Symmetry: D2
Subunit: 231 residues, 4 copies
């Protein structure tokens, strides 16, 4: 199927498919079962920020999630993306809900990639009704307050369960190329995860996939709209 490398912000622990007993951030390499995780003290109702970075020198993929005036969670995983992903990929954001729900509102998102001396950079400090440079999939919608809502949110502002949505940047990104000395990318997005129930689910993720990636069927809930199964 698709080849997926993602940084997940997993709000709901699915101990049955290998998740730790608490909300966590993790690094997924072609599997929803994080290669590396870290505890994450999710703050329902507050706007968070996630910074992801990778560079060909270290070949280490790192992420840092933080809320203002609170400690951050950080997770890093050694991975050579040339052996994982194909040269050209698409980058995006994904999110799901299941029995439990939460809003998966993205307030902004940026990305920069350099293959050294080619570069790509985009920034969305706001989202429009018809964001033509975003390929929306699933329940994802834009213009919803100038925000990007990855999963279903009803008029009253409430999140719906069993929802899945993604947003991919329109242009393919040349993630690697052997003749390059330094290949690198970084991404950043602010989000607003808010759930009326005691247990929010399921999470948000930044991912890099094959250019023709699409939401696997049934990947609501714990699969975060990324994987076809829990393998």
């Amino acid at each position: 199927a698709d080849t997926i490398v993602a940084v997940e912000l997993d709000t709901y622990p699915n101990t049955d498919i290998g998740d730790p007993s608490y909300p966590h951030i993790g690094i997924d390499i072609k599997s929803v079962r994080s290669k590396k995780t870290a505890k994450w003290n999710m703050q329902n109702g507050k706007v968070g920020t996630a910074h992801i970075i990778y560079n060909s020198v270290d070949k280490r993929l790192s992420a840092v999630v933080s809320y203002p005036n609170a400690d951050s969670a950080t997770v890093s995983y050694d991975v050579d993306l040339d052996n994982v992903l194909p040269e050209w990929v698409r980058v995006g954001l994904s999110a799901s809900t299941g029995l439990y729900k939460e809003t998966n509102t993205i307030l902004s998102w940026s990305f920069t990639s350099k293959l050294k001396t080619n570069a790509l950079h985009f920034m969305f400090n706001q989202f429009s009704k018809d964001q033509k440079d975003l390929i929306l999939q699933g329940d994802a919608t834009t213009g919803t307050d100038g925000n990007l809502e990855l999963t279903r949110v009803s008029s009253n502002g409430s999140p719906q369960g069993s929802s899945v949505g993604r947003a991919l940047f329109y242009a393919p990104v040349h993630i690697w190329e052997s003749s390059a000395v330094v290949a690198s990318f970084e991404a950043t997005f602010t989000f607003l995860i808010k759930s009326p129930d005691s247990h929010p689910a399921d999470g948000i993720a930044f991912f890099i996939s094959n250019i023709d990636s699409s939401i696997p069927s049934g990947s609501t809930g714990r699969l975060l709209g990324l994987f076809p199964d829990a393998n």
Copy 2:
């Protein structure tokens, strides 16, 4: 048909369709008959550089073409692109040949656009065999020495007449949006125009069009792959 705003580097004067009696650079607003031109001392065989810029404050579109150790040609034209182009556009390079020919080799190309924020930036300091973020049209080919050849070039390196090709960046660009204080873009490309014959033709152009723009039929020669007619 398409809505075209372009900066042309016209190597061959077509006095019959309004061109001055010498190679020139010009500003085309929905017409191949430049709204404003400037004499251009084209240097056959040498790599040139073109810088184009527009900003919503001045609403002036300027371009500057130069060769090392030589003077530069400059042309500017007052235009409010909100009344000319649609909000979302695609940006690209185009080129043609006719009876007379020349190579229309692009060695690099970059573009940056900002709608104040929201930004887009790309840089091609080299072109690969399959540049997936470029939509090639006509005789345009990549990987041809790490270069982008807009028009036909045979094995021996010779240009072919009656050729037309374009290259558009894959993602749509939000060129304007009323709620913005400052909308602006700039582009830069280096090129290599070389022709074995005494009179090279026909030229190169940076253009901004409707997202679904394609080479008008028969637009080889003097139409620079931009316009359906000489109106």
Copy 3:
């Protein structure tokens, strides 16, 4: 004395020294008597934004001042800065008060300059207690809420009259150099002008000066901390 090119946001009209009968923005070229002005509907108590831009192609200096949900004021003036300013300059913000006062709080400030390719860029989305890359002059202070206060503000938050202060970026900026095809800069700052009295004064200005520029004596009030006299 000093060579000054500035974009002023004049909150108090000094009809005696050539000011129009209303708050206005203007372009000052070695004179406090604006070469070009434009009416400005200053909003006491609200955070404004100013965008300034210049490029060697047009040789036009433009500025745009705006408040959210309000129309903007724009002023442009044709000027070849190579004949006005020296190659190397320093850039900064300045402000004053006289009989009447107002807070001249700068909340952020950025600048980018390119001589093409050499470039300089800095951004202050916040100011620290000891901002070592800023040369503060006069009553200017930093750390004052993470903000830069150009003129005196007392504990209770009230502005003091007869105050003058400036803030210059530490490094000299190569504003021009004949061997360059395109020389250009742009600057942006957000401010908070608030005055308890019915008539706020005197204004804020972005300026470019000789590297060793300092506040002329007595330049409080209408001289905006830029000029030694009203000539």
Copy 4:
């Protein structure tokens, strides 16, 4: 004395002060005795490129040196710069010669730093006769062919032994600040190390120091103009 963090490109091995038996690149943390080194196949007469990077997420300082069509050398070292360097620093390039010599020509140099936001970026694709934003120390000179010569070179283009020179960017750089989630910098320079003799010396280095750093006395040769001794 000064606090120094540098990435050295050591062309001459000093086995007596802890150097491996071959030219190497290394990471120096307040000591000329590299915390981590890597073999470097220096190419006399060819222009090389060095990329250095650090980010607060990984807290790993990496460097990659490469010559076209040749393998690159890479060295990384885990270090938390908040415990090593002071908040505000100056960044620069340094170089020396001793009994043996070589040219230490820098053809270009760029640097970018971000504390998140707040940012600093500069680029020198060429150096002028009087580069006012560069603080030159020792035998360092600019305008020397549009290049920056860190150590003595004589009209005929020959390098002189026992030479030492540095070039620091004029403005202080806010390297760290506790209230920041992500602090990071990167630097890049191309160089031309050419020596007429059989055993070139001594090397070039990118360094970060206390703002008031200056070449320690006698630091020619193996001390690379960075350290007062070999401890």
